[PDB]
Amino acid sequence: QISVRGLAGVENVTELKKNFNRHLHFTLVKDRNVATPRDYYFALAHTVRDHLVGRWIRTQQHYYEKDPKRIYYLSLEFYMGRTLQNTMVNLALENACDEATYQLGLDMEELEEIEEDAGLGNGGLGRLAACFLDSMATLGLAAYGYGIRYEFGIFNQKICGGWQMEEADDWLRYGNPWEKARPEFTLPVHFYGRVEHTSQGAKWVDTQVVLAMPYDTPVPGYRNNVVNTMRLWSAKAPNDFNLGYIQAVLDRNLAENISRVLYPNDNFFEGKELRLKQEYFVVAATLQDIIRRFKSSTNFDAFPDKVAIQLNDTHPSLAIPELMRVLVDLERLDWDKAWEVTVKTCAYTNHTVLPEALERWPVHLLETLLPRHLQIIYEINQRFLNRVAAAFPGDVDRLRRMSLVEEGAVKRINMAHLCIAGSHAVNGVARIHSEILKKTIFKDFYELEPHKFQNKTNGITPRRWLVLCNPGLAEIIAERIGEEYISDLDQLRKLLSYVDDEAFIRDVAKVKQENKLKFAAYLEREYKVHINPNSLFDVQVKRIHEYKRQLLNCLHVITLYNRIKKEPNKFVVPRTVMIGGKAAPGYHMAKMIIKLITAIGDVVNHDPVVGDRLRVIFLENYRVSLAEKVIPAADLSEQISTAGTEASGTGNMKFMLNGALTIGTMDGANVEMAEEAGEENFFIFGMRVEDVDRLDQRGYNAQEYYDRIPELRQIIEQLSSGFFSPKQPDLFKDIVNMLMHHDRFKVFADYEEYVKCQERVSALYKNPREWTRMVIRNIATSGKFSSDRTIAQYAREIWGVEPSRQRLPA
Amino acid sequence: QISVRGLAGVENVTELKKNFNRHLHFTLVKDRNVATPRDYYFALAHTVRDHLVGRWIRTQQHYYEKDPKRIYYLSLEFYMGRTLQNTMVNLALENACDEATYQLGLDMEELEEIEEDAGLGNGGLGRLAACFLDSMATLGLAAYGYGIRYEFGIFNQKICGGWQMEEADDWLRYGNPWEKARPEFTLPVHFYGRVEHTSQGAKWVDTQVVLAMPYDTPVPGYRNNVVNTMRLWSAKAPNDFNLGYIQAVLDRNLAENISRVLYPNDNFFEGKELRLKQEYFVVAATLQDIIRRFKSSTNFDAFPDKVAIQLNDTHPSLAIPELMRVLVDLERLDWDKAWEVTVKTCAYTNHTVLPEALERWPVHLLETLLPRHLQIIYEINQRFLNRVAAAFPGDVDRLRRMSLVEEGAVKRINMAHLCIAGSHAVNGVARIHSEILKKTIFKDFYELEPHKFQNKTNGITPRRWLVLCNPGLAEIIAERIGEEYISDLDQLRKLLSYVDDEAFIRDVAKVKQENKLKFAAYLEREYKVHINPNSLFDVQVKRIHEYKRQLLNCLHVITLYNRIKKEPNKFVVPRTVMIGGKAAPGYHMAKMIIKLITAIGDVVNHDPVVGDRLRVIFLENYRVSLAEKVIPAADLSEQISTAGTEASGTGNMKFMLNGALTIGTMDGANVEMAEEAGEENFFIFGMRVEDVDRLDQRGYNAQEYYDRIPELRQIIEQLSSGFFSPKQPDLFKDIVNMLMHHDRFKVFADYEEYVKCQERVSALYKNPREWTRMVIRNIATSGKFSSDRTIAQYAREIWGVEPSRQRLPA
């Protein structure tokens, strides 16, 4: 149908049909009389997977012979979403499979909808990992993602009476045709036990063993025939485990719980033992696999020339003392040489400055669980602090601030400090965030080793985030500038020369229109709710947090509502306000915010005076595959975190790429995006970082805003007095109370500027031609935010490897 | 190579090679450079499985169109062993696969050794189920085996210091290429809850739900292109299960424990709640599948014309009240019509008279777990006892004896009584066992309903138990009488005309010789132990029990030893005594017997005066695949249970078929085997049933035997005084104590006759020609003990369906 989806060659189509029928018969053991749509999905998945395997085997063979430096991307999260369409897109099979399926009388698009998300992450950090794997394969890097094969990923969110309920996400129930179990490469991981000192050094003894079984998933590059591996470990008990009889067998569950479930906290540290076991399990099994591969080429001097380990946040920070343990305890290198190798191997990416996200493990946990690692940690600390003492003699406060060991009722290890001491590079994830690392929370470390600290602004894959989810937009762009921009997104810059082209303005706006009709329809089918597709689609989708200020958005929604009620007969630009995202299960406040949103929707959606001028929708179960649908359909992207709190964001980038305008604060990558498009092409408002700091220095007093802004006061009164909750008048008193007295995120301080700026958005939307021209300027300047750019910068400035666009042979 | 293994056609061999390489590449994702022997096994398994699927789909389609009466064989155990070779044999692919593998430079026989046993049973009862499935498919019956997919089958047995240690049997670790998950046919099973009575009848409410997910395994008939299904249920939690968050997810394990592990008791009842859950889980999920299939043809009158349910022991006895529950509570039939349908549907096979095997569930367990079933049970009981009252008026003792409810400190349900009341047929498993059911333990039931009680003597499949494990013997038989005997074992009778044929005597004896060399070699390789292959192979293999009298065998071994020590320079026929089998984990006595055997082996195998005249080997980890190796190699089969205790046996039949002579009591099927071969062709000794009864009537006093038999006294003194355990002199005092004071199985009463009869065996073994002639008479008369005969008798006299040897089209 559309060109970017590749060729439907006669031969190709015939082969796909025959392979489909082969899998349906031999793999699924069905005929056409009994097959369900699910059977059909699986037959297609197996047919497509068969095209990946030869390329997978050739790529892995290529790395064996050439022996390039290998990149190991360690993460507790890989938020992959669906694999089938992505695989078609990257192998250029999309149109052929469309044709083949059509001719067997099936709708490929219906079969696509049957695949479960691989929801092995919370939000930004795990989706980033997924984008990075795509980019590493597209750039020909010898890269491996390593993580945990959780049996249950992020919970499925159901809204019941306006409250979130969590259901287990049983994503393996029907099988995963993408993974290959590799039970032959099972490795032991040790826990508990104790340290004995011999003449022969320290020995870690009387440990409990858990086995780590790896599952490999192929990661295809974009049309280059490279297929890299994502390896996820599963926990299995040893066969002599516990070994009355029955209970010993049933107790195998305690060891296998390690890989059972993803912790569903986004940007929040919970100090539970099972989480620490997860962290150690992935690090220990991964390092042994790393060392094994290196030995198949005694001489550890070359180890950092052959290996890079990237730590995605501090979650795999134990890689540092684990690598020391192996080099010192098992390979018998002396301390200083081991440390040298460790530092040159490891690099740390920080993802947040929020203090509640920082991992600080109680010493007594590490003592019981990983006694040897604790000793290595104290030793790292001592040698590190001796270096601080020598550079800053007499500065006793600096020593206490920089210690890996924090004093207190409970002693704790600061995992961020350990990552910094034990890495040759530390990066933040957007320019302002990296600056903040240098000026505030890692200032002391920056003064000791300025050379360690770098920026690598985040990006997103234009494969998933444009060609896959927005084929119509991909197509009208390709019609003008060709197809090359897909692996070279800077080429979108060529579109600035079409900003005054009537046919292009028309086509951009038509795509948006088609995307909106398609989403409006999807809302009706799967969730029985009726929207005006001529309204402005005002979207905020992301995890529910106080720092993300879904609450600021609510205040605006209520403001529009109160303006309509006051002047019912005035014209207003119609809007559909869509907010979606999951709350962490024990995050009470986040759960109250979901409930407030549904309560506003209960009042606004049923008021006959409002008509179809304003609708408030809560998008249930927000996840990667819902993002693929709602983002192409958006007009306005809400990115309204208090300046200084969103390290980067990546949602902001998805929407820029897909033809939405942005209203946001100067936070995170919003700053770079505004600089790329021009500030006049962006809806910037609110305090800057400097403003937040000024306000904190004299004290934030929310009452001042309440006293001076009558629109704001009316909103608070409505909330307090039961307007949004007639059956429980005081239902929202925690929200009000927090806003008036305990708001770390300064919702009221940004309210006036926000509402004003929202009026400018409305004014521009009345003028379709100028809106679409500003959109074109956004899309045309989104090149920088390709994760292909990000990855090339990690490769050159951290890993010391050269990216390559060369295709391997077919 | 050998004819019975089928044709190696040029085309067939070429296709197998290409399919092998396809699976190695696409299914296993390996090339020849990285593949392990395990990879090679899997490639072959997938290649062979592909030949089963078309036949599987055609067979199941055939049953849909013809709609024959369907047989449902319900069992908590299916002891399948390995599948690959059996599948080749039944599809006539064996020689082609041999050729194909050879040409790719692989030894098929090495790859065969890599497959794990499917060890989903304890012993005789579960192997019987496996033989029956083979026979049902060979006879063209529309039959389904239903059971539980246990994650851990019977434990792997390791001998450590002469003691059994149990290790978990993780048989799915590497995947099972034979099964097909069928997650779309998942069904709910209910537990706990309570009964409400409406005007609308009783309703079972507030239950916990566990889901039953089915896995299907193909069962191929012998060269008839029929492939039947074995469906095993796995337990899964519902997604809203429990649904802090993490703990709720981890607690999913409590529901999934139902299918985790096989209870490793053979012929012993342990009244634990988890076992009752297993029993209900398989019955509830199976009945719903049965009813569903029946409805896809309101009218339950025809239900027994379309369905037979065979209960393999009382383990699925809850099928009876479950079927009542569904008919009465859900379909709203009146009681009497439901009962009529239930009785005509169900049939019960009893497998033992040992009282410790009888299942008697405490009322309080059923009350909590299955409150509605308990009410149906009391109602069944009441109506049943009213029928007894009317036939035997005034006989109040009969009422108490026949009750389904036993009185006592703890009230209990007698599951055997329930099976009898609720079945149109009850059978024992050998002629004497069925007679004993009529005369002793079910006498009262037999007087009420004589017509219910039948015999169906057990048999074994000559596919696994001859062609597969003993191809050389199969071949020299086929050379004389052709190949037809494989599905018509009565044709072995034709061999009596070769009893005086020198070439045939020579070939029978040569096969035995080859089998012994092959086993002698296998002992050396895999277990480092050195045997004389010119000795008599004296084998006792079976579960370790007191009733099976491994101890009587030990006494004989020690007797031979003491005779050699007394007259070292006398000639004796050399023997290798091999004893193997597992003990139930908490069966202390069974565990002491294993230890005694190893202790005798410690003394006998290291005595230089004995030389290679006597060896005592404990065969570790006895299981189906070890039986396939040791049985073809045996000369003498020990079947020496106290008369009246072994309901049938089936091991006895395997050895008869494979050219061993038998020494045994008149117990079980030994009686029918002796009657088939002629008593002069069998080594019969010991008390008959009548003798045991006479001895019980006046009191068994072991001291009398000790006082009168000096050989016996010396043995007891040696045991008592530490001869077999120098480091712990009193190690065997429980054994001695039991033998002298508390022996229910009368080991001493049979000792003298046993030793004498063992001398006759030795005398015949000195005369190779006459030994082999007696062997020929055994093999030639083993026809009756084909499970094809057994199954044809169940089909005609219980199920009311006609067996068929017609082949379905290819």
Ligand SMILES: O=c1cc(-c2ccccc2)oc2cc(O)c(O)c(O)c12
């Ligand atoms: O996920 C959570 C995130 C945050 C949070 C608060 C302020 C700023 C950043 C993150 O607080 C929490 C507090 C809790 O008691 C809890 O159970 C949680 O799961 C969270």
Ligand SMILES: O=c1cc(-c2ccccc2)oc2cc(O)c(O)c(O)c12
């Ligand atoms: O499996 C068992 C079999 C028998 C047995 C004893 C005499 C006749 C038949 C069977 O006794 C037992 C006693 C136990 O205490 C025990 O834990 C067991 O597992 C068993």
Ligand SMILES: *Cc1c(COP(=O)(O)O)cnc(C)c1O
């Ligand atoms: C991109 C993405 C995120 C990150 O969104 P932010 O707005 O950067 O917080 C979270 N969840 C999903 C499903 C995503 O696709």
Ligand SMILES: *Cc1c(COP(=O)(O)O)cnc(C)c1O
């Ligand atoms: C046949 C068989 C049995 C039954 O043997 P008996 O001598 O009848 O008790 C038990 N275990 C295995 C592995 C078998 O093959």
